[PDB]
PDB file of C-alpha atoms in Angstrom:
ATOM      1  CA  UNK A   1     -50.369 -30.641  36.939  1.00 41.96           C
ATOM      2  CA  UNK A   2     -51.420 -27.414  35.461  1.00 41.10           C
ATOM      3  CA  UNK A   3     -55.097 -27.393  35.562  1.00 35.84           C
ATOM      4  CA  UNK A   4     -55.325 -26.339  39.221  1.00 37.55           C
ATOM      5  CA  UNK A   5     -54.261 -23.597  38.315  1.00 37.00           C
ATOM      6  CA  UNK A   6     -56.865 -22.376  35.790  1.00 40.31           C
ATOM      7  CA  UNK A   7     -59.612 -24.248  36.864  1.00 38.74           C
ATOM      8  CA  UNK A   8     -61.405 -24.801  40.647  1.00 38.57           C
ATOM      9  CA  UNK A   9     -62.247 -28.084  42.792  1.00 40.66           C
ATOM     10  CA  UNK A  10     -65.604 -28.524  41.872  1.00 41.06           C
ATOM     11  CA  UNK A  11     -65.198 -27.907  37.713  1.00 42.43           C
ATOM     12  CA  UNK A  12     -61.905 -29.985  37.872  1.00 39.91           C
ATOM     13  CA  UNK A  13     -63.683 -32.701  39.342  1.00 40.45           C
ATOM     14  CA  UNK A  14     -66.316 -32.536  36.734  1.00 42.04           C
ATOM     15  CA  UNK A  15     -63.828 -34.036  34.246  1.00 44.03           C
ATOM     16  CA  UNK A  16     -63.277 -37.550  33.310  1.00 45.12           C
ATOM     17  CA  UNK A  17     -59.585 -38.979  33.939  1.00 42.98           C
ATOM     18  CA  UNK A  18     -58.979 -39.313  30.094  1.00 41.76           C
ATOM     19  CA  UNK A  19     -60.169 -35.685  29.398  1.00 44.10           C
ATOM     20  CA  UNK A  20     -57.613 -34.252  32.368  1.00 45.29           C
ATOM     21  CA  UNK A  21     -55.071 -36.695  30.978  1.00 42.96           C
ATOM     22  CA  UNK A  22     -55.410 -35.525  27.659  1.00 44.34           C
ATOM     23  CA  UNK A  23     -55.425 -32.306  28.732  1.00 44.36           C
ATOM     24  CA  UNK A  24     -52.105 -32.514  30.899  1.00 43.59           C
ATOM     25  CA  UNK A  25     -50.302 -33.898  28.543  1.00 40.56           C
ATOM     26  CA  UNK A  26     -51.387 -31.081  25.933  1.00 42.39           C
ATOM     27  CA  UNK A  27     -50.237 -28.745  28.356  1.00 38.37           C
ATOM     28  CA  UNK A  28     -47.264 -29.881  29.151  1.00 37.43           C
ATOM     29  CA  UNK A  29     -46.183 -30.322  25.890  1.00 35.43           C
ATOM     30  CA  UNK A  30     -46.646 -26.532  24.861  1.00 35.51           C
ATOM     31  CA  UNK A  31     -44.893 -25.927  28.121  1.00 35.26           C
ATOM     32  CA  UNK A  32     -41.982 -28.260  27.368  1.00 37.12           C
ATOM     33  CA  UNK A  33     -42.255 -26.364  23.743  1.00 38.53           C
ATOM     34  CA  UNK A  34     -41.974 -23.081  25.753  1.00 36.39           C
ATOM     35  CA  UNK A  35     -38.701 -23.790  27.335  1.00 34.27           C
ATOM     36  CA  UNK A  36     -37.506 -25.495  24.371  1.00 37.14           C
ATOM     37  CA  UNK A  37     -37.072 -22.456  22.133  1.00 38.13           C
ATOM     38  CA  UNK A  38     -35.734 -20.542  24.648  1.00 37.86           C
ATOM     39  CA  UNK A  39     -32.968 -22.988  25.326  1.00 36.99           C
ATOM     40  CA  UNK A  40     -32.315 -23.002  21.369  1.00 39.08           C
ATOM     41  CA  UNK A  41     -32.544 -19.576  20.826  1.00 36.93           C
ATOM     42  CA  UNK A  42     -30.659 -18.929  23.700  1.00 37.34           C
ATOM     43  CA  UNK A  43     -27.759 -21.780  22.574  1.00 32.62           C
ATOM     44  CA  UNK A  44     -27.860 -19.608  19.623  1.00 31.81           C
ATOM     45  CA  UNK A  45     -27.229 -16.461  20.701  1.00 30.81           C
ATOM     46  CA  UNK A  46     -23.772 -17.605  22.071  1.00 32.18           C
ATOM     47  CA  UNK A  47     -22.653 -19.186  19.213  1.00 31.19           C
ATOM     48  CA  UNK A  48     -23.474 -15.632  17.181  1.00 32.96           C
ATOM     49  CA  UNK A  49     -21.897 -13.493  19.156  1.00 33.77           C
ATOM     50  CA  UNK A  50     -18.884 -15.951  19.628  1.00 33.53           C
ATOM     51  CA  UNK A  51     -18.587 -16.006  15.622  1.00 35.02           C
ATOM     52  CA  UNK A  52     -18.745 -12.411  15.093  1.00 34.39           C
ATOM     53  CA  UNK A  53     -16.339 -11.885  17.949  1.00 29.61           C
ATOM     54  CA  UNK A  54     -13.791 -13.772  16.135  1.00 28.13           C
ATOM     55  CA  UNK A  55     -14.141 -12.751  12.446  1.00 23.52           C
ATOM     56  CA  UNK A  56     -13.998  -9.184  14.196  1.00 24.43           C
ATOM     57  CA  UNK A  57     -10.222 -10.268  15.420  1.00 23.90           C
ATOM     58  CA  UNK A  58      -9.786 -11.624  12.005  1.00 27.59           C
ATOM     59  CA  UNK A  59     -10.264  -8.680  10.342  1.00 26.72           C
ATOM     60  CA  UNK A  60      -8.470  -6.146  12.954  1.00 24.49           C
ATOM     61  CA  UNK A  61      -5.717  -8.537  11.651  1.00 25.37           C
ATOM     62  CA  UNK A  62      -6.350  -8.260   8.517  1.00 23.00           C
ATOM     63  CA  UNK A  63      -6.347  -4.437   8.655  1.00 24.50           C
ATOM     64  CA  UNK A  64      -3.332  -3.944  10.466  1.00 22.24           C
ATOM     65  CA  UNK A  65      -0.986  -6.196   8.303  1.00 21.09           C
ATOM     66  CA  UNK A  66      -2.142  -4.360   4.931  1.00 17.52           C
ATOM     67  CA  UNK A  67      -0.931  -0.868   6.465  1.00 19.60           C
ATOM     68  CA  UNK A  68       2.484  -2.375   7.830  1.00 16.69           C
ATOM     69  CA  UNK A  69       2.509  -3.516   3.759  1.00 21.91           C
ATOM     70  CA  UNK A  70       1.614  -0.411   2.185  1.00 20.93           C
ATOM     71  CA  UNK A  71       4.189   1.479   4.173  1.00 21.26           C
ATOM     72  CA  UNK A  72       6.549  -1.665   2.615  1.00 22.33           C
ATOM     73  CA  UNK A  73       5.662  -1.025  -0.884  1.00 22.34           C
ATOM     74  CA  UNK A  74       6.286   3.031  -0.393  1.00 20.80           C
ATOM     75  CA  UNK A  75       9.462   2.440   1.190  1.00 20.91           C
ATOM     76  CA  UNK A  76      11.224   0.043  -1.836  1.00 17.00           C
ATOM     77  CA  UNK A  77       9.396   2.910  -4.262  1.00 18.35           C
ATOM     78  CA  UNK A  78      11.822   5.210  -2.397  1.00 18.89           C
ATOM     79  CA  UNK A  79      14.862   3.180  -2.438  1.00 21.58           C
ATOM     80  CA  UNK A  80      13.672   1.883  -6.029  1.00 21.63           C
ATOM     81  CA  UNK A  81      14.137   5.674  -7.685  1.00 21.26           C
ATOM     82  CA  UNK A  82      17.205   6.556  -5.094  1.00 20.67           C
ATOM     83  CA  UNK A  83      19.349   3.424  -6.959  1.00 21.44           C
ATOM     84  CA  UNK A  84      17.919   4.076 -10.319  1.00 22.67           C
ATOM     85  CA  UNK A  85      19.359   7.228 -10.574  1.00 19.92           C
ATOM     86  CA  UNK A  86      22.331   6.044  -9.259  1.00 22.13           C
ATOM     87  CA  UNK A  87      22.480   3.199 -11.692  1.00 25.25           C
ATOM     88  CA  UNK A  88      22.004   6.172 -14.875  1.00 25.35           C
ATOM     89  CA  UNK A  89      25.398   7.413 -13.239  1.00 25.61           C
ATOM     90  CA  UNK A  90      27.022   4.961 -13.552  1.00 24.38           C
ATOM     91  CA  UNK A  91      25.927   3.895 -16.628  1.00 24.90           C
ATOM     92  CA  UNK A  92      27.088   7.233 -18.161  1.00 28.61           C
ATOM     93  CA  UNK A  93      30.427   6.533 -16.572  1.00 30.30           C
ATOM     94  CA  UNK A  94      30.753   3.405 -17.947  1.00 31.57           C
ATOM     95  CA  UNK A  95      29.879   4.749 -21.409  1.00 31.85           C
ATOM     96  CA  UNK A  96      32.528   7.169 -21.491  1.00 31.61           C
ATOM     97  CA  UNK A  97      34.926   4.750 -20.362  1.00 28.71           C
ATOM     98  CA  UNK A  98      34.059   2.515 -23.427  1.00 28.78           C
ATOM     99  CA  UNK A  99      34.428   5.440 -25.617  1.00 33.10           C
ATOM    100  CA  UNK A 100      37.977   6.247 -24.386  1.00 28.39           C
ATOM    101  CA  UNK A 101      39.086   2.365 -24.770  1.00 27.26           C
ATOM    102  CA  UNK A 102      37.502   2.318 -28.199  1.00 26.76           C
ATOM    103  CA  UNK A 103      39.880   5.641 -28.517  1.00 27.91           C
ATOM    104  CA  UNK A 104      42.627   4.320 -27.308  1.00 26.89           C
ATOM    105  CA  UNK A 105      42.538   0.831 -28.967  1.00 22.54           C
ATOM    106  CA  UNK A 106      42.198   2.754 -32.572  1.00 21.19           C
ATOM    107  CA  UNK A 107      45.056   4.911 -31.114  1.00 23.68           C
ATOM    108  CA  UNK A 108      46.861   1.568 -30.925  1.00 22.54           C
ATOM    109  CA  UNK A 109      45.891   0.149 -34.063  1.00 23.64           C
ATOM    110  CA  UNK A 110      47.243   2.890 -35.716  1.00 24.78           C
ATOM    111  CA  UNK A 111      50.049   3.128 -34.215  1.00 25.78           C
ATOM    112  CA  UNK A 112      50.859  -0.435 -35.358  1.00 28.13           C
ATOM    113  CA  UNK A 113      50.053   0.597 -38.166  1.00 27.08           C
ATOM    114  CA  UNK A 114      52.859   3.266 -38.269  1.00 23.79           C
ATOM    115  CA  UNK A 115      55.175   0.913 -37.028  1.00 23.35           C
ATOM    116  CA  UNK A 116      55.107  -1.804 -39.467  1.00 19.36           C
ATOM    117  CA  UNK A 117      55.568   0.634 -42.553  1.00 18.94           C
ATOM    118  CA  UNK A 118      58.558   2.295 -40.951  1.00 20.99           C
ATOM    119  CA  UNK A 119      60.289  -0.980 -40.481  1.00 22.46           C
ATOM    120  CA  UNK A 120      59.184  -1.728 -44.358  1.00 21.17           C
ATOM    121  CA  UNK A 121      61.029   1.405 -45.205  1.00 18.06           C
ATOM    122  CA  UNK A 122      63.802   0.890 -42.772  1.00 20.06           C
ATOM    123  CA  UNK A 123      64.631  -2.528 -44.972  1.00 19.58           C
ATOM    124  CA  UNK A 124      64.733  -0.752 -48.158  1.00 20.23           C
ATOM    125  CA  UNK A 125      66.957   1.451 -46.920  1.00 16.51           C
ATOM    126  CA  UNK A 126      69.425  -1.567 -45.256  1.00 15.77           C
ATOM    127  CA  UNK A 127      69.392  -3.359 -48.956  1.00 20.70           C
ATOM    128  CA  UNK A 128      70.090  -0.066 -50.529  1.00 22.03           C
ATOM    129  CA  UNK A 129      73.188  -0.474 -48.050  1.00 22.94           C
ATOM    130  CA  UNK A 130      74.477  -3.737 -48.889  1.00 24.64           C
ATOM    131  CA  UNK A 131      73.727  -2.529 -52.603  1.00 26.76           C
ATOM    132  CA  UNK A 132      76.346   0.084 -52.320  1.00 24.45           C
ATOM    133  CA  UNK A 133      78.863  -0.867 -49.447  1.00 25.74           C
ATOM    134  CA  UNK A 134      79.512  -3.603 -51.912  1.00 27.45           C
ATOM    135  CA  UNK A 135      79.290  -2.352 -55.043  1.00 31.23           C
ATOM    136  CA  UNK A 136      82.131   0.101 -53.024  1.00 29.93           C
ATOM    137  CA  UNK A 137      84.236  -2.970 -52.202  1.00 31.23           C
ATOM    138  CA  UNK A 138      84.672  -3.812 -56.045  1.00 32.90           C
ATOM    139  CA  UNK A 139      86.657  -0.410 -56.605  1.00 31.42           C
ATOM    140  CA  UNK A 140      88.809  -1.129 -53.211  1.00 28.64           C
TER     141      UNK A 140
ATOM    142  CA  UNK B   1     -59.760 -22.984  18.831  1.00 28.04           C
ATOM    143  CA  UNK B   2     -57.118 -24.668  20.641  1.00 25.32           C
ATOM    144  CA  UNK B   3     -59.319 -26.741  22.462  1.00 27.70           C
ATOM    145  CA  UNK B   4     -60.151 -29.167  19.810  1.00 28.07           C
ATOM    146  CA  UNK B   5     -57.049 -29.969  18.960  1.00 27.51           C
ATOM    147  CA  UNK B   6     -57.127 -32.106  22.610  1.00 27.65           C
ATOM    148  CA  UNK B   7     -60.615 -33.646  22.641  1.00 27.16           C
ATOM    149  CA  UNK B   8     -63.252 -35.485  20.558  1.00 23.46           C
ATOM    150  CA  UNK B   9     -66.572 -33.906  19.876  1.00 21.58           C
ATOM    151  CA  UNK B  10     -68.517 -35.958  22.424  1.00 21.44           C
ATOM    152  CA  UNK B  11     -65.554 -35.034  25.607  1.00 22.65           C
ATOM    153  CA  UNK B  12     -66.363 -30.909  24.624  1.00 23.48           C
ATOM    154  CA  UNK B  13     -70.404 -31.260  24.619  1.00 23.12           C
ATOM    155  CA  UNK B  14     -69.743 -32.743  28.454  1.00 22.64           C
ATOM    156  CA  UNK B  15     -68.456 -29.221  29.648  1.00 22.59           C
ATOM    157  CA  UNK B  16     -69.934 -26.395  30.188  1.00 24.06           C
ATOM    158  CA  UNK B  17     -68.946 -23.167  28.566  1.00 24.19           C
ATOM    159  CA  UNK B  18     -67.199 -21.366  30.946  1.00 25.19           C
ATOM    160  CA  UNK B  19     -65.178 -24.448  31.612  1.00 21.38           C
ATOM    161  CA  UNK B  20     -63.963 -23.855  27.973  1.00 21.10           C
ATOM    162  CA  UNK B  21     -63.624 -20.494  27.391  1.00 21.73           C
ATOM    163  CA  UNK B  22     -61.042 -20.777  30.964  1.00 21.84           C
ATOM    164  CA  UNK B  23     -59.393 -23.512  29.122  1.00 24.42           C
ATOM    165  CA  UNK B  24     -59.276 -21.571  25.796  1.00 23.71           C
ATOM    166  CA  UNK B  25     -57.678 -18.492  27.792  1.00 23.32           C
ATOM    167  CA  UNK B  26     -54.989 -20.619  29.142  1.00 22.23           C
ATOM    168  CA  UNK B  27     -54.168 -22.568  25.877  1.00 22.79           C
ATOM    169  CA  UNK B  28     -54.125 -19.207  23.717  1.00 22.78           C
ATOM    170  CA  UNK B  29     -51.762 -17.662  25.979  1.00 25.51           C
ATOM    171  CA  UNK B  30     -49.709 -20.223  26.018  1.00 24.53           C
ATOM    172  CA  UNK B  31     -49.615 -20.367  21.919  1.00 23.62           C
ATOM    173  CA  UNK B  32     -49.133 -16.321  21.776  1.00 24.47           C
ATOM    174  CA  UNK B  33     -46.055 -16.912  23.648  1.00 25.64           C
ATOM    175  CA  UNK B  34     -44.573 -19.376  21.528  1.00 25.27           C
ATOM    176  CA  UNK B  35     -45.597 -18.055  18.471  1.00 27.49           C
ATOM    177  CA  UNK B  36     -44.297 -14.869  19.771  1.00 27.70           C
ATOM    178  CA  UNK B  37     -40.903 -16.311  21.257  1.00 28.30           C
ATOM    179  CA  UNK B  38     -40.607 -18.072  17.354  1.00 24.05           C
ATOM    180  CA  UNK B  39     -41.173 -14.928  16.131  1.00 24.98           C
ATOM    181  CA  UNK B  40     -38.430 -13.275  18.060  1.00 24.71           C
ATOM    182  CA  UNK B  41     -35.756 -16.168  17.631  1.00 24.46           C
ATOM    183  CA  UNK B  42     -36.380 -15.814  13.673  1.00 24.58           C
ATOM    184  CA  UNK B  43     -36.083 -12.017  13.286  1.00 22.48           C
ATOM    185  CA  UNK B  44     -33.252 -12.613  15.484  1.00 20.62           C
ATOM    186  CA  UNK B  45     -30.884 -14.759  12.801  1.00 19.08           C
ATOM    187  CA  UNK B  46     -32.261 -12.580  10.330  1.00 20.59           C
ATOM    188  CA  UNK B  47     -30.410  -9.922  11.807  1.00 19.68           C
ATOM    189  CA  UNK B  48     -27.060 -12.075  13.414  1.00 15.81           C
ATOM    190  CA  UNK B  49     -26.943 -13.207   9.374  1.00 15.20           C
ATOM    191  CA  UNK B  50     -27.027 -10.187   8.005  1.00 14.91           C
ATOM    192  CA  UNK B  51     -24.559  -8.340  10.361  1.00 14.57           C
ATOM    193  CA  UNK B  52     -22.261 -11.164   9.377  1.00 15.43           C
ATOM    194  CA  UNK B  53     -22.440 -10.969   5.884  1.00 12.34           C
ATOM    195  CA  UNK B  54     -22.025  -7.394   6.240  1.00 12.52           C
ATOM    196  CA  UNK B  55     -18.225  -8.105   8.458  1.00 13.53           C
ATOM    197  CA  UNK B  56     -17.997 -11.099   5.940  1.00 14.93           C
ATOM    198  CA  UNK B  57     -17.875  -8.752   2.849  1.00 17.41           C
ATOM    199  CA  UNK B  58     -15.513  -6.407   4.774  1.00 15.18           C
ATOM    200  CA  UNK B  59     -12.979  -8.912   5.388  1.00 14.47           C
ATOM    201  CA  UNK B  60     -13.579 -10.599   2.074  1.00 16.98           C
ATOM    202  CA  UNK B  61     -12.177  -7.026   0.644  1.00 17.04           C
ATOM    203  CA  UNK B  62      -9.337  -5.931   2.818  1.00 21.03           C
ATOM    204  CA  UNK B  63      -7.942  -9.177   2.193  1.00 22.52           C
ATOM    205  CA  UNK B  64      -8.330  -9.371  -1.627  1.00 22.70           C
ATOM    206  CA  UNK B  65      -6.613  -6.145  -1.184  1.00 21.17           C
ATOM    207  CA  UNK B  66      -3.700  -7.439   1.576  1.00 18.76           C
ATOM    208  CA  UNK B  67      -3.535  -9.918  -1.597  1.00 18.06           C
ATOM    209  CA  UNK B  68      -2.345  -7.292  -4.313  1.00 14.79           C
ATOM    210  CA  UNK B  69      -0.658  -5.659  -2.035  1.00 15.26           C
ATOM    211  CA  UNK B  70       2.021  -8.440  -1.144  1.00 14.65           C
ATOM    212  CA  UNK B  71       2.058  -9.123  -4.996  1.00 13.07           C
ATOM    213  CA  UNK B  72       3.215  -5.495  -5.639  1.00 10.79           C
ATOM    214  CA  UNK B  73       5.335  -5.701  -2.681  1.00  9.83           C
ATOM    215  CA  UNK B  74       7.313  -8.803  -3.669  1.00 11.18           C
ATOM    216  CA  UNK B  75       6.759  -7.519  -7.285  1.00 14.05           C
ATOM    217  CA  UNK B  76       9.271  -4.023  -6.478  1.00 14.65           C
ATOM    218  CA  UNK B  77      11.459  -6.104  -3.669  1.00 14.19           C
ATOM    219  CA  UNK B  78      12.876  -8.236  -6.390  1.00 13.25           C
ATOM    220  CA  UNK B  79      13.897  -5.476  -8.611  1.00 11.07           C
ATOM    221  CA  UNK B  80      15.265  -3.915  -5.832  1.00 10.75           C
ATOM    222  CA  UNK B  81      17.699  -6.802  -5.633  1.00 12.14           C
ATOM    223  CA  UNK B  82      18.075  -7.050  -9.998  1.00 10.73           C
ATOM    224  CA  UNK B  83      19.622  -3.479 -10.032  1.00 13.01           C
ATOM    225  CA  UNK B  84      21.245  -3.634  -7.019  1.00 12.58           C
ATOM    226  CA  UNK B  85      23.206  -6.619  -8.872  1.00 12.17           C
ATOM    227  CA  UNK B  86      23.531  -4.315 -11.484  1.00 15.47           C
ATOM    228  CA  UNK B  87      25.198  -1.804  -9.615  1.00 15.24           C
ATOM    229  CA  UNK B  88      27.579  -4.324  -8.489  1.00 16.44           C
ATOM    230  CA  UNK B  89      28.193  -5.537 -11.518  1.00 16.05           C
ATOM    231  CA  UNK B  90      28.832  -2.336 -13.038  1.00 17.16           C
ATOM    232  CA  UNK B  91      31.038  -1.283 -10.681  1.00 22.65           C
ATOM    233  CA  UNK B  92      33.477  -4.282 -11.364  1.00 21.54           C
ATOM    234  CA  UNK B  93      33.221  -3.480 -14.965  1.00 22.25           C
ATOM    235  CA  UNK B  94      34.326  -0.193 -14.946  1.00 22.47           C
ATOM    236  CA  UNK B  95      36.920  -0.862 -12.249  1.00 22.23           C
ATOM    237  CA  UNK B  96      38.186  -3.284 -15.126  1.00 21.46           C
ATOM    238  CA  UNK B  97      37.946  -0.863 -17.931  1.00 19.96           C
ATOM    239  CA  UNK B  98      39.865   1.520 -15.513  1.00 20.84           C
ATOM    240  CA  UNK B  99      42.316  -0.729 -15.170  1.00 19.50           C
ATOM    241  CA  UNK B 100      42.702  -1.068 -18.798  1.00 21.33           C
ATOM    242  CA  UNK B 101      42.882   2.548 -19.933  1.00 22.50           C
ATOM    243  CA  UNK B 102      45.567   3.213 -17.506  1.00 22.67           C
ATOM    244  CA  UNK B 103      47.754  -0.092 -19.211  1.00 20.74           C
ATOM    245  CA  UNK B 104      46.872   1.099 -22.416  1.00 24.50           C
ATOM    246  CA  UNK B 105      48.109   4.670 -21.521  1.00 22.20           C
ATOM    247  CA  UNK B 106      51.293   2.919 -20.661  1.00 22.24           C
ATOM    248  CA  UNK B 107      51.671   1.139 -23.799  1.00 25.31           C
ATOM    249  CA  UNK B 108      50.881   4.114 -25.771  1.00 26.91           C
ATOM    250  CA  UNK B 109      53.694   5.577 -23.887  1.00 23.92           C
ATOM    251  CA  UNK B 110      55.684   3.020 -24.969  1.00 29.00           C
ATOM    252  CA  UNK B 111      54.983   2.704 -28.850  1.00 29.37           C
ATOM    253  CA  UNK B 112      55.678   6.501 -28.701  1.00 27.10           C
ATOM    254  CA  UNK B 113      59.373   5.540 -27.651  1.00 25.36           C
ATOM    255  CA  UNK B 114      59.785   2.783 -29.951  1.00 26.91           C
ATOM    256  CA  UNK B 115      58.437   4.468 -32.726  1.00 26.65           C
ATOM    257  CA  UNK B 116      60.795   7.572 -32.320  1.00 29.02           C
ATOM    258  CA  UNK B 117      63.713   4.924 -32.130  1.00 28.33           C
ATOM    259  CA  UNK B 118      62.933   3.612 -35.767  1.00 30.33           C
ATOM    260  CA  UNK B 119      62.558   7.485 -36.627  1.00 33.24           C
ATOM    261  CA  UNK B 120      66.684   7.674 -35.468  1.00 36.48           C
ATOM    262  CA  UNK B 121      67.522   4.486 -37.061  1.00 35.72           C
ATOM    263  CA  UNK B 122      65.786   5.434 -40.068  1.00 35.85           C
ATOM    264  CA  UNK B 123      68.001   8.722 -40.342  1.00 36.49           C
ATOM    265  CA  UNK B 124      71.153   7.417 -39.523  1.00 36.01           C
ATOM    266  CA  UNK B 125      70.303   5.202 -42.940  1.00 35.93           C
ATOM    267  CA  UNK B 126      69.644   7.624 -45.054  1.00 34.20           C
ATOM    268  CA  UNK B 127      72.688   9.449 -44.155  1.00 31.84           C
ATOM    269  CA  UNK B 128      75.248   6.644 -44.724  1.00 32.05           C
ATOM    270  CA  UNK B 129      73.052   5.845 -47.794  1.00 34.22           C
ATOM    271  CA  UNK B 130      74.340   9.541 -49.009  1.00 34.79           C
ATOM    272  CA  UNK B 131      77.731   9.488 -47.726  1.00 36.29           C
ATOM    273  CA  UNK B 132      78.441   5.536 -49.463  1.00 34.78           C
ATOM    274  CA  UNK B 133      76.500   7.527 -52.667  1.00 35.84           C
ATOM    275  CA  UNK B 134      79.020  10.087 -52.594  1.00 33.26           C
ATOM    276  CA  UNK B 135      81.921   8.172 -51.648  1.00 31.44           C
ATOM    277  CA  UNK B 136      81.055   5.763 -55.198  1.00 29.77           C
ATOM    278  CA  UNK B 137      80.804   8.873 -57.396  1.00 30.86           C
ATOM    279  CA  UNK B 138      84.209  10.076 -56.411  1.00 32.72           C
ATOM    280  CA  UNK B 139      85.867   6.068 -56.933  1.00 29.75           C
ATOM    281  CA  UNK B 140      84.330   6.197 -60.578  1.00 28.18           C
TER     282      UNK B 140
END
């Protein structure tokens, strides 16, 4: 009951049941309105600031994992170049150790070489031997 | 008017004016605060949207960014590991061809020996060749 309120005894009675009904209800209603979009409003609120609470955390997060990666990727960059020049080293080592094998194994070759004709003209020289010793034996 | 919304032409006629314009205070009132706590709630999400669109974007970026940075990351932390298998496998190859040299070194010093050998083999030939030569010249 809200009209006592705004209106006195003597006008209040004035008016027919239906009309204070009517008007009651009307009240009420704009009331119950009233109270109804502050509870939604204030529902609302909580959910908001509950939402941006989180993403906030979500973010922090997201922040703080892409620096511990950055110093990740700067640290193999390091270790990248340290190897690589120790991997031209090596690589120039290697080559001159192919270049002395490729040395040596023509060395080889040749010397194979040198051997096989010298036992060529070691045989000419043992036939030339039998030739003579005997070729001697007929004038024994 | 607010009044009209709750009675029928004949029930307003029936009351006299001051009666209404007391009810028309009360009823206007009561609308100005709900249109003005409507007003509030709506500027209100305006606001709770557009600060989270604003966070939104912010995450949206530092983790397209977290992204390519774990791409480049991984990216470089697998080569690490293909010349580092490089190394190793270098080093066992020219711990091979070391290896090798020093055999070869030793055969060299080998064919060296044998070859000189046939050299004194070879001369000892070539002098009996002259000496049976001589020795037929003199028996004919």
């Amino acid at each position: 009951a809200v009209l006592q309120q705004v209106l006195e005894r003597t006008e209040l009675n004035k008016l027919p049941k239906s009309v204070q009904n009517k008007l009651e209800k009307f009240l009420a209603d704009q009331q119950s309105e009233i109270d109804g979009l502050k509870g939604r409003h204030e529902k609302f609120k909580v959910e908001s600031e509950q939402q941006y609470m989180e993403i906030e955390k979500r973010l922090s997060h997201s922040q703080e994992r892409l620096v511990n990666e950055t110093r990740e990727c700067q640290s193999l960059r390091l270790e990248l170049e340290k190897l690589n020049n120790q991997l031209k080293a090596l690589t120039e080592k290697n080559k001159e150790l192919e270049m002395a094998q490729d040395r040596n194994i023509a060395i080889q070759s040749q010397m194979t070489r040198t051997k096989e004709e010298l036992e060529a003209e070691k045989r000419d020289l043992i036939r030339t031997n039998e030739r003579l010793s005997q070729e001697l034996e007929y004038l024994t």
